[PDB]
Design a protein around this nucleic acid. Sequence first.
DNA 1: TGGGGGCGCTGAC
DNA 2: GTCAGCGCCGCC
Length: 327
Amino acid sequence: MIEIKDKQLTGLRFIDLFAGLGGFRLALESCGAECVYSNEWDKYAQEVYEMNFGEKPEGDITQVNEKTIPDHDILCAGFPCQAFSISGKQKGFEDSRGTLFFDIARIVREKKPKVVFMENVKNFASHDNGNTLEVVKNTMNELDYSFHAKVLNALDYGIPQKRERIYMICFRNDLNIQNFQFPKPFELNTFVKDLLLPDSEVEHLVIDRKDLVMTNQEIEQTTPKTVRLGIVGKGGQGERIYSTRGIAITLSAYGGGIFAKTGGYLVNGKTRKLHPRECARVMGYPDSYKVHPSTSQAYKQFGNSVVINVLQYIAYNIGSSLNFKPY
DNA sequence: TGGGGGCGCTGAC
DNA sequence: GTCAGCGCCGCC
Ligand SMILES: Nc1ncnc2c1ncn2[C@@H]1O[C@H](CSCC[C@H](N)C(=O)O)[C@@H](O)[C@H]1O
């Protein structure tokens, strides 16, 4: 994550729904905002959240009375994506994990925050012939909010990961915000190899599979894209190897394959998956952030998370818009 | 709400 | 056909 000198969100309160690791919290707090409520039902996510912020998020949001949620200015929510991801079954709203947005709408209707800031996977934007996004849009408009949605790739914002996500920023209409803008892309000068840990700290992650098939030569020039170098097995998810001179593939939460949830990389002649700390860095998390003691849970948590830097630029722009109140 | 890994299909070229 | 995906499923 980056440093934010001008705290655009100072004095603003926000809630951290579907908190996970608290990526939205790091992002908004870096801009000066104050978190007044967090919600996350996963036992392990609650533990790591507590390790880093000192509070245990409240459980199952579908059972929380929206009237008991503290007043706030910005509602943050990177809601479940299994039901919308290109990697899943795409049952969408028909999925038990796909109706969480309506819980968000329920809370918004009641608390009417100034801003609603949501995130989901790229496929969310085209799911069900675009009907899914339209539904979110119409729901927000009905609740009297504007709707700004755009898919941003983390590689365009200083982080070496091809993580494409749709970000939805909504302003309550009475605020008449007409100048919100998604941050503009800039050249990437950081690649996977710049975030790796020393070899001595990741030796245990080195795997030597005799079914390894190198399909492309390593590149010596850094490039802002994923560069596949080979595969193991049939080359399915988690069985693909990439160059560290390129960018990281999208980290996942329930992913499988021998290089589960991070993908494999060629590092100093050997092939290995990423270490949880490297996952943190590829997600823009500061080294000061404490990862969960269970590596499997840590991989899952970062795989479900958000790239801090991207949210920071967006949060900064939300604040910039809110602060422009000329006479 | 465990931890590991083989998979197989979809979306967007 | 190319290829990558906050995933799925069954195993222990
Ligand atoms: N009913 C529910 N109540 C509370 N949390 C829920 C929930 N259903 C799913 N979740 C939580 O929703 C999260 C979605 S992933 C979002 C992660 C978050 N942006 C962070 O930065 O990491 C998961 O952690 C999941 O456990």
